[PDB]
Design an enzyme around this catalytic site. Structure first.
Site, PDB file in Angstrom:
ATOM      1  N   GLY A  73     -11.348   9.551   6.153  1.00 17.98           N
ATOM      2  CA  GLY A  73     -11.392   8.862   4.875  1.00 17.98           C
ATOM      3  C   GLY A  73     -12.119   7.544   5.087  1.00 17.98           C
ATOM      4  O   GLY A  73     -11.847   6.551   4.404  1.00 17.98           O
ATOM      5  N   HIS A 100      -0.013  -0.919  -9.790  1.00  5.66           N
ATOM      6  CA  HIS A 100      -1.167  -0.611  -8.959  1.00  5.66           C
ATOM      7  C   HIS A 100      -2.501  -0.627  -9.704  1.00  5.66           C
ATOM      8  O   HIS A 100      -2.541  -0.560 -10.937  1.00  5.66           O
ATOM      9  CB  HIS A 100      -0.975   0.780  -8.330  1.00  5.66           C
ATOM     10  CG  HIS A 100       0.025   0.815  -7.216  1.00  5.66           C
ATOM     11  ND1 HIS A 100       1.386   0.849  -7.441  1.00  5.66           N
ATOM     12  CD2 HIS A 100      -0.137   0.816  -5.869  1.00  5.66           C
ATOM     13  CE1 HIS A 100       2.016   0.867  -6.277  1.00  5.66           C
ATOM     14  NE2 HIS A 100       1.117   0.847  -5.309  1.00  5.66           N
ATOM     15  N   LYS A 110      -5.558   4.690  -8.812  1.00  8.37           N
ATOM     16  CA  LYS A 110      -4.507   5.482  -8.187  1.00  8.37           C
ATOM     17  C   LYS A 110      -4.230   6.728  -9.020  1.00  8.37           C
ATOM     18  O   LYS A 110      -3.950   6.637 -10.216  1.00  8.37           O
ATOM     19  CB  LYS A 110      -3.235   4.634  -8.030  1.00  8.37           C
ATOM     20  CG  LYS A 110      -2.167   5.284  -7.200  1.00  8.37           C
ATOM     21  CD  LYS A 110      -1.150   4.280  -6.750  1.00  8.37           C
ATOM     22  CE  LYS A 110      -0.099   4.939  -5.903  1.00  8.37           C
ATOM     23  NZ  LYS A 110      -0.718   5.723  -4.812  1.00  8.37           N
ATOM     24  N   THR A 163       5.831   4.958  -2.365  1.00  4.25           N
ATOM     25  CA  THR A 163       6.692   3.846  -2.008  1.00  4.25           C
ATOM     26  C   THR A 163       7.814   3.658  -3.041  1.00  4.25           C
ATOM     27  O   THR A 163       8.991   3.551  -2.680  1.00  4.25           O
ATOM     28  CB  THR A 163       5.876   2.543  -1.924  1.00  4.25           C
ATOM     29  OG1 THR A 163       4.820   2.701  -0.967  1.00  4.25           O
ATOM     30  CG2 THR A 163       6.752   1.389  -1.503  1.00  4.25           C
TER      31      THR A 163
HETATM   32  N1  LIG Z   1       0.649   4.365   3.372  1.00  4.70           N
HETATM   33  C1  LIG Z   1       0.080   3.224   2.971  1.00  4.70           C
HETATM   34  O1  LIG Z   1       0.404   2.134   3.381  1.00  4.70           O
HETATM   35  C2  LIG Z   1      -0.979   3.341   2.045  1.00  4.70           C
HETATM   36  C3  LIG Z   1      -1.347   4.594   1.482  1.00  4.70           C
HETATM   37  N2  LIG Z   1      -2.439   4.696   0.623  1.00  4.70           N
HETATM   38  C4  LIG Z   1      -2.757   6.058   0.139  1.00  4.70           C
HETATM   39  O2  LIG Z   1      -3.841   6.526   0.987  1.00  4.70           O
HETATM   40  C5  LIG Z   1      -4.786   7.290   0.222  1.00  4.70           C
HETATM   41  C6  LIG Z   1      -6.082   6.546   0.137  1.00  4.70           C
HETATM   42  O3  LIG Z   1      -6.206   5.628  -1.028  1.00  4.70           O
HETATM   43  P1  LIG Z   1      -7.567   4.986  -1.311  1.00  4.70           P
HETATM   44  O4  LIG Z   1      -8.230   4.508  -0.049  1.00  4.70           O
HETATM   45  O5  LIG Z   1      -7.374   4.034  -2.433  1.00  4.70           O
HETATM   46  O6  LIG Z   1      -8.399   6.237  -1.871  1.00  4.70           O
HETATM   47  P2  LIG Z   1      -9.991   6.436  -1.906  1.00  4.70           P
HETATM   48  O7  LIG Z   1     -10.505   5.888  -3.145  1.00  4.70           O
HETATM   49  O8  LIG Z   1     -10.509   5.868  -0.671  1.00  4.70           O
HETATM   50  O9  LIG Z   1     -10.067   8.001  -1.862  1.00  4.70           O
HETATM   51  C7  LIG Z   1     -10.012   8.596  -0.416  1.00  4.70           C
HETATM   52  C8  LIG Z   1     -11.239   8.642   0.489  1.00  4.70           C
HETATM   53  O10 LIG Z   1     -11.163   9.612   1.573  1.00  4.70           O
HETATM   54  C9  LIG Z   1     -12.267  10.547   1.437  1.00  4.70           C
HETATM   55  N3  LIG Z   1     -11.914  11.937   1.893  1.00  4.70           N
HETATM   56  C10 LIG Z   1     -11.543  12.802   0.904  1.00  4.70           C
HETATM   57  N4  LIG Z   1     -11.269  14.060   1.340  1.00  4.70           N
HETATM   58  C11 LIG Z   1     -11.476  13.907   2.646  1.00  4.70           C
HETATM   59  C12 LIG Z   1     -11.340  14.870   3.612  1.00  4.70           C
HETATM   60  N5  LIG Z   1     -10.967  16.118   3.323  1.00  4.70           N
HETATM   61  N6  LIG Z   1     -11.587  14.552   4.931  1.00  4.70           N
HETATM   62  C13 LIG Z   1     -11.974  13.268   5.184  1.00  4.70           C
HETATM   63  N7  LIG Z   1     -12.118  12.291   4.251  1.00  4.70           N
HETATM   64  C14 LIG Z   1     -11.847  12.668   2.973  1.00  4.70           C
HETATM   65  C15 LIG Z   1     -12.735  10.441   0.023  1.00  4.70           C
HETATM   66  O11 LIG Z   1     -14.112  10.796   0.006  1.00  4.70           O
HETATM   67  C16 LIG Z   1     -12.615   8.912  -0.163  1.00  4.70           C
HETATM   68  O12 LIG Z   1     -13.575   8.297   0.690  1.00  4.70           O
HETATM   69  C17 LIG Z   1      -4.080   7.570  -1.115  1.00  4.70           C
HETATM   70  O13 LIG Z   1      -3.245   8.718  -1.067  1.00  4.70           O
HETATM   71  C18 LIG Z   1      -3.279   6.223  -1.295  1.00  4.70           C
HETATM   72  O14 LIG Z   1      -2.243   6.310  -2.251  1.00  4.70           O
HETATM   73  C19 LIG Z   1      -3.219   3.573   0.262  1.00  4.70           C
HETATM   74  C20 LIG Z   1      -2.894   2.308   0.791  1.00  4.70           C
HETATM   75  C21 LIG Z   1      -1.777   2.193   1.683  1.00  4.70           C
HETATM   76  O1  LIG Z   2      -3.596   2.127  -3.288  1.00  7.09           O
HETATM   77  C1  LIG Z   2      -2.584   3.047  -3.335  1.00  7.09           C
HETATM   78  O2  LIG Z   2      -2.798   4.261  -3.907  1.00  7.09           O
HETATM   79  C2  LIG Z   2      -1.333   2.755  -2.797  1.00  7.09           C
HETATM   80  C3  LIG Z   2      -1.044   1.538  -2.137  1.00  7.09           C
HETATM   81  C4  LIG Z   2       0.239   1.317  -1.581  1.00  7.09           C
HETATM   82  C5  LIG Z   2       1.250   2.298  -1.698  1.00  7.09           C
HETATM   83  C6  LIG Z   2       0.967   3.510  -2.370  1.00  7.09           C
HETATM   84  C7  LIG Z   2       1.897   4.486  -2.542  1.00  7.09           C
HETATM   85  O3  LIG Z   2       3.132   4.353  -1.987  1.00  7.09           O
HETATM   86  O4  LIG Z   2       1.580   5.592  -3.248  1.00  7.09           O
HETATM   87  N1  LIG Z   2      -0.326   3.741  -2.913  1.00  7.09           N
END
Ligand SMILES: NC(=O)C1=CN([C@@H]2O[C@H](COP(=O)(O)OP(=O)(O)OC[C@H]3O[C@@H](n4cnc5c(N)ncnc54)[C@H](O)[C@@H]3O)[C@@H](O)[C@H]2O)C=CC1
Ligand SMILES: O=C(O)c1cccc(C(=O)O)n1
Ligand SMILES: NC(=O)C1=CN([C@@H]2O[C@H](COP(=O)(O)OP(=O)(O)OC[C@H]3O[C@@H](n4cnc5c(N)ncnc54)[C@H](O)[C@@H]3O)[C@@H](O)[C@H]2O)C=CC1
Ligand SMILES: NC(=O)C1=CN([C@@H]2O[C@H](COP(=O)(O)OP(=O)(O)OC[C@H]3O[C@@H](n4cnc5c(N)ncnc54)[C@H](O)[C@@H]3O)[C@@H](O)[C@H]2O)C=CC1
Ligand SMILES: NC(=O)C1=CN([C@@H]2O[C@H](COP(=O)(O)OP(=O)(O)OC[C@H]3O[C@@H](n4cnc5c(N)ncnc54)[C@H](O)[C@@H]3O)[C@@H](O)[C@H]2O)C=CC1
Ligand SMILES: O=C(O)c1cccc(C(=O)O)n1
Ligand SMILES: O=C(O)c1cccc(C(=O)O)n1
Ligand SMILES: O=C(O)c1cccc(C(=O)O)n1
Lengths: 245, 245, 245, 245
Positions: free
Chosen positions: C7, C132, C136, C143
């Site tokens: 990603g 958010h 999203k 969370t």
């Molecule tokens: N656990 C945490 O602390 C956090 C979790 N997240 C979550 O992580 C994910 C990412 O959010 P964002 O970065 O805002 O999304 P984003 O807008 O970056 O969408 C995801 C990215 O990964 C790419 N990607 C998609 N399918 C893929 C694949 N099959 N293999 C490799 N790369 C692929 C997409 O092209 C895009 O670049 C979401 O599910 C979000 O809710 C986001 C922030 C913190």
């Molecule tokens: O940018 C996001 O989608 C995001 C950021 C923090 C937490 C979560 C989440 O718990 O889904 N999602």
């Protein structure tokens, strides 16, 4: 001035009773709650009534009041266009009788709605979070819904809130009020609170109003009670009595 | 339009550089930071300059710019009445040169100051809490101080905030700005935030603005950059452009 | 340590790439986004992978990774019991491979969930407001849902939130998560924010977490990336790596 | 159990009177305010006293009470180390007498102090904003000061809050409490509120407590009134009862 209170035993109603009782220029002439005859009003020669009762009975009380030429300051919620119309109707055959219906009598609330109107067009996003005590029967609050209506009307011609939501639990995104999301929180310890959130690139504007106490509604009500006969007919909202002083 | 940036390497300045660079109707014609000659401006045929530098150098840059007929959009803080004075007398000798100085370019901030002006007279209490990143040199912020000035001027003729404080640690009650308390929070993780608190019996009104990101200042700046020549001379504030106050 | 990112072009993913690239003790050995072959991983001899992609592809990436003994630090959302089980399954035949899945990598978020667990039993009411950015896809956030789960489990044996709601617009009262209302706000200008509200007679407790920036997720992630092989198997949440130091 | 109240006519004291009066297991046996003889206590066979009076008189009432073996639940503020000292030496001569002094009896407040203790070491910055009604004589509140003490002690060995402030109006940065800035807001409409702010790179944690009403202090007080004799001697804080810290 002879003032009567409908909903005298209610959370808000009892507060109004003390307020009237304590006002040096007002005579408390009636205290009605559920099951009290309305003629108690006409019996004590009541001139103006404060109504904080229930959506299921307000129209009933309103017909009587207008019928007998008693002025009404109404805080009870749930009024609609047809209701207003009905009132509007009723009052037509009853000139010189004034009815004031306000979705909220706290000044901060009235100001909040005013400000939201002004800020709406400058942002990409607007949502409304409303927070109230757990005894409130209706969600969202009338204040919140009216505030969403105003924001929507002020943004006519602009695109909708951007939202990429693709999966969600039902209700997570709140109630849709004219395309403005409204969220209702019911929590012990609260009284009446509202937050209006505006967002655009890298910044947000929040207008927050907090009624920590039901006394917050008295000044607004008494202001209306006193100048009631100034505007005969139907007035909605406190704004007309404020954008003066 | 040829736009140059003073403070190009700064937290805010670099963001403006990218913004100008990316604007289809603007040519980035200069990028000066500490130790770059000002003639780089005149050298590149710069027409308008965005200045986000430092209170210690802004007047120096302003004299040069006005001197050479370059227009200036200044976000740098620390301007005072006397300062506002030199820039005018400088412009009189260079009419057709416009200078716009705004204590804040985020719209929510400008709107917040507008709203505070409107609400001030309706409450017994007003305080200002301002929150910024730990790299900010000045406290309180200029935005906060200007907001306290506005609230004070809007309450001319009314009594002061009621305060029964009899014992306190020094500073606990904040800075006095024209009789309005101002509190400055410097915390890691923050960017630029302000809360205006109004209170009266049983209720409070809070107008909160949050810049989560420095991009929040770009629309306001570019708006000013583009209509800069609409008003020759000095313009203090973004209000005149936003057609409001 | 050879670290790869799935990603890599994503909002969060690109931030992790810079973070890894800048870490003196980590070698960025892979940068995959949509349409990049997974063997790029095995090709660069990647030891650990950071995954911030999508619920629709994470299980696919997880099978490959575990299959090839690559450790995984997963932030991607949408994991469920069956998914965990699946992972749990998969990892059984693959000992010495560690997988860490955290619903949130920001420390304040992890602390918030911890505190909510502790406060739940002392109050009559608990609701969750989550806020958010408008990109999203899922509401409520993982969370938020996990936080509602924890509050509910901590209040086992106690009565439900008191609510006298009798009439309401659909969705006004939010999503029901194990009997804890959860509200999702999607607003321009926001990144990731959550408020936990507890209420009882005359008082409320609010635990608020704000991610003003996606860098907030890096320390947590890198901490996990570095100690990944300490706990072979499946770890959920950051807590295990924190209630030490 | 025979309970008496010192400060019976006070904002808080009157609320305690109603609470005791309404408790089925407690007998209101005394109601003293300014100018009432203390013997009214001994006269009515009072066993335990609730004191919500004034820093200038509490030690006077405490000597009498301990002297006569009456237990005391004290909410009155302004206690210090030396003060905590006299009450002990007073009790040594009257073992079997219990005195409980709590800087705050609202549960959310006690929990907030607990949480702040836990979060302190995880952040670079910590400040305390405290907000109270305009009749409060002391600033900052004792709760706020104690909360700053706890955060400071929990961060022993760590560097100070980072602050680049170079110019400021006096007081803008608040009161220094063991190196933790504390800001006191005195606003009409408020009762008792506190915010603890922690910040680190790109995120902040806020623990907010709100007493919207003085009833919020009753459960904590009555809990203490009832188990008062469980611990002879002095107990500072409600923590020991809440079985936590
Ligand atoms: N656990 C945490 O602390 C956090 C979790 N997240 C979550 O992580 C994910 C990412 O959010 P964002 O970065 O805002 O999304 P984003 O807008 O970056 O969408 C995801 C990215 O990964 C790419 N990607 C998609 N399918 C893929 C694949 N099959 N293999 C490799 N790369 C692929 C997409 O092209 C895009 O670049 C979401 O599910 C979000 O809710 C986001 C922030 C913190
Ligand atoms: O940018 C996001 O989608 C995001 C950021 C923090 C937490 C979560 C989440 O718990 O889904 N999602
Ligand atoms: N406009 C405003 O500023 C405000 C409006 N409200 C609204 O006003 C109403 C009152 O709320 P609360 O006081 O919390 O409710 P409540 O708990 O007091 O319920 C209403 C009271 O009126 C009584 N009453 C019921 N039917 C009656 C009848 N037919 N005739 C006379 N009395 C009757 C009930 O017995 C009860 O005493 C609600 O609709 C509430 O949402 C509340 C606060 C402010
Ligand atoms: N009005 C508004 O909306 C805003 C105003 N500001 C103000 O703008 C200024 C900049 O803030 P930051 O970017 O955070 O500070 P910063 O210190 O990060 O940015 C200043 C930069 O300009 C450089 N510079 C210094 N002297 C210079 C000179 N003589 N010629 C050219 N460049 C020079 C400095 O080296 C540094 O790169 C401050 O006064 C701040 O308070 C900040 C944000 C918004
Ligand atoms: N620990 C806690 O949770 C809380 C502590 N407090 C503190 O408790 C005290 C009371 O606060 P309020 O009720 O707002 O103040 P108040 O001034 O309204 O109440 C004090 C009252 O006690 C009376 N009194 C004074 N001297 C007395 C004496 N010698 N003997 C008997 N009664 C006397 C005063 O006339 C007044 O009626 C203050 O120190 C306040 O900071 C207030 C709320 C909560
Ligand atoms: O607009 C409303 O519905 C409203 C406003 C303030 C208080 C209440 C209430 O106590 O029900 N309801
Ligand atoms: O009014 C101010 O002084 C102000 C406003 C926004 C940001 C900053 C800053 O980053 O210094 N300063
Ligand atoms: O810690 C304090 O000093 C405190 C806490 C709650 C209320 C009050 C008060 O009403 O004075 N004071």
């Amino acid at each position: 001035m002879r003032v009567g209170v409908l909903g005298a035993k209610g959370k808000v109603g009892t507060t109004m009773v003390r307020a009237v009782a304590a006002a040096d220029d007002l005579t408390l002439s009636a205290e009605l709650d559920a099951g009290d005859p309305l003629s108690l009003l006409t019996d004590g020669n009541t001139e103006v009534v404060i109504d904080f009762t229930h959506p299921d009975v307000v129209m009933g009380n309103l017909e009587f009041l207008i019928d007998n030429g008693i002025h009404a300051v109404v805080g009870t919620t749930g009024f609609t266009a047809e209701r207003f119309q009905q009132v509007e109707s009723w009052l037509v055959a009853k000139p010189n009788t004034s009815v004031l219906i306000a979705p909220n009598f706290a000044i901060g609330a009235v100001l909040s709605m005013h400000f939201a109107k002004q800020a709406a067009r400058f942002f990409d996003s607007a949502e409304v979070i409303e927070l109230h005590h757990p005894h409130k029967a209706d969600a969202p609050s009338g204040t919140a819904a009216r505030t969403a209506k105003l924001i929507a009307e002020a943004r006519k011609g602009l695109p909708p809130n951007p939202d990429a939501t693709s999966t969600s639990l039902p209700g997570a995104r709140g109630a849709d009020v004219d395309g403005i999301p409204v969220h209702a929180v019911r929590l012990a310890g609260l009284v009446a609170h509202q937050e209006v959130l505006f967002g655009t690139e890298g910044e947000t504007l929040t207008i927050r109003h907090d009624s920590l106490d039901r006394t917050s509604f008295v000044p607004g009500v008494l202001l209306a009670v006193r100048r009631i006969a100034e505007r005969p007919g139907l007035t909605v909202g406190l704004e007309p009595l404020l954008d003066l002083h």
